[PDB]
Design an enzyme around this catalytic site. Structure first.
Site, mmCIF file in Angstrom:
data_model
loop_
_atom_site.group_PDB
_atom_site.id
_atom_site.type_symbol
_atom_site.label_atom_id
_atom_site.label_comp_id
_atom_site.label_asym_id
_atom_site.label_seq_id
_atom_site.Cartn_x
_atom_site.Cartn_y
_atom_site.Cartn_z
ATOM 1 C CB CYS A 88 -1.026 -0.025 1.124
ATOM 2 S SG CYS A 88 -2.332 -1.199 0.736
ATOM 3 C CB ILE A 89 3.145 2.838 -1.934
ATOM 4 C CG1 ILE A 89 3.129 2.010 -3.213
ATOM 5 C CG2 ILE A 89 3.999 2.164 -0.881
ATOM 6 C CD1 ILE A 89 4.511 1.694 -3.741
#
Lengths: 164, 28
Positions: A88-89
């Site tokens: 999750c970026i």
């Protein structure tokens, strides 16, 4: 071939032609360019140095309008990686009215990005545990409160990925 | 290159990445 297939074959050609250092990525089988396997090495002189971390990348039908999903299949311990391996970026989040707790108008995905760029960004993310998503709350907290222990855990994560 | 060539090269790059990382980890 649809737009997605065209772009993905193009990207892969460039990757095979000029292989990026510490990053190996491509379709598991060329009959389905929508499912890739990637391998990235933790950068030298960082806490994940020499780890070798496999991930699956699953591309949407509308690529490159939308980002792939990327999930590590090995054990990880990092503030921006969920317990299930999902990365999750901001660069993997589709532009949309739902911050999903990323940042001040955080930089979202755009067709300007590429698989090479996603993977380089993930390599950077490892080197610079940048708590932007709080995906692994435990890793987030330890990075903040007990950095030196985090480094200990990270070497274990490396050893495990090497099968040592 | 053909797909078969590409797929084989890919599998090779992956094996070699792991082998060199192990060496560097153990060398350090």
């Amino acid at each position: 071939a649809g737009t997605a297939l065209k772009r993905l074959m193009a990207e892969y050609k460039q990757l095979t032609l000029n292989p990026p250092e510490g990053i190996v990525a491509g379709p598991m089988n060329e009959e389905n360019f929508f499912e890739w396997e990637a391998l990235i090495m933790g950068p030298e002189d960082t806490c994940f140095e020499f780890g070798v971390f496999p991930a699956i990348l699953s591309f949407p039908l509308d690529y490159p309008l939308s980002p792939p999903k990327m999930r590590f299949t090995c054990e990880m311990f990092h503030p921006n990686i969920y317990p299930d391996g999902r990365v999750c970026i901001s660069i993997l989040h589709a532009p949309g009215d739902d911050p999903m707790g990323y940042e001040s108008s955080a930089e979202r995905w755009s067709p300007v990005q590429s698989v090479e760029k996603i993977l380089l960004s993930v390599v950077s993310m490892l080197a610079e545990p940048n708590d932007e998503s709080g995906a692994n709350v435990d890793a987030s907290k330890m990075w903040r409160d007990d950095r030196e222990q985090f480094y200990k855990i990270a070497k274990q994560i490396v050893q495990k990925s090497l099968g040592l | 290159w053909s797909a078969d060539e590409r797929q084989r090269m890919l599998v090779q790059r992956k094996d070699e990445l792991l082998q060199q990382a192990r060496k560097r980890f153990l060398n350090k």
